[PDB]
């Protein structure tokens, strides 16, 4: 029995019935494997700034908590 080998009819209407879906567009994009030896430095940067901020936080907390 001969069978229709292809069609693309009604496909666009089916697509637009639910509306063309958009990606969620989140804010941050992961750095799992992007250009290392730069984020390698950046992680140490973040660790250092966090360490300074948190040690100052603990110093203030102690000098206010006696």
């Amino acid at each position: 029995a001969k069978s229709k080998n292809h069609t693309n009819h009604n496909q666009n209407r089916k697509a637009h019935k639910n509306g063309i879906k958009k990606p969620k567009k989140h804010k941050f994009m992961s750095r799992k494997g992007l250009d290392p030896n730069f984020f390698r430095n950046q992680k140490y940067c973040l660790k250092g700034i966090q360490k300074k901020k948190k040690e100052l936080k603990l110093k203030a907390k102690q000098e206010k908590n006696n």
Partner: protein, 155 residues
């Protein structure tokens, strides 16, 4: 029956007339930053680091930079939805865009105008004009320049 890499680029990837030869020796010197908007143009003089069939002419943004590679994020349609796609291309093919120079110029004009506008405390319709209905005015024309028109005969 055949859907290879460069399929159907007999003219698209072909370099335009009298534009053969290697890429311009200044296109390497453009400056790129994360978050910039960029256009993707497939050149053919360079071979490796090549974009693909569909992506010629599209836009995107810069999120990945290597010694020579550039990764651009693009919205490519597939049936019922749009999904992000990251494409890695080379500096020869990539090209700085103009999709945001209009808005950048508008922002610069805003910064250099509304500053003094606020200094004077004036409100303006800083929204884009989109000129529609023209106003009504009076104009002059002497009777010596009114040239009539009439339909033409056949031949």
């Amino acid at each position: 029956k055949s859907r290879g890499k460069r399929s159907g680029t007999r003219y698209k990837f072909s370099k335009k007339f009298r534009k053969h030869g290697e890429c311009t020796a200044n296109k390497y010197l453009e400056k790129l930053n994360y978050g910039d908007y960029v256009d993707i143009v497939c050149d053919s003089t360079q071979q490796k680091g090549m974009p693909f069939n569909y992506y010629h002419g599209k836009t995107g943004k810069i999120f990945h930079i290597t010694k020579r590679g550039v990764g651009v994020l693009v919205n490519k349609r597939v049936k019922h939805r749009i999904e992000q796609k990251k494409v890695c291309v080379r500096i020869e093919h990539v090209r700085k865009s103009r999709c945001n120079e209009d808005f950048l110029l508008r922002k610069i004009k805003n910064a250099e105008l509304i500053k003094e506008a606020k200094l004077k405390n004036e409100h303006i319709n800083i929204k884009r004009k989109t000129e529609g209905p023209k106003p009504a005015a009076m104009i002059k024309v002497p009777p010596s320049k009114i040239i009539t028109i009439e339909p033409l005969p056949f031949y």
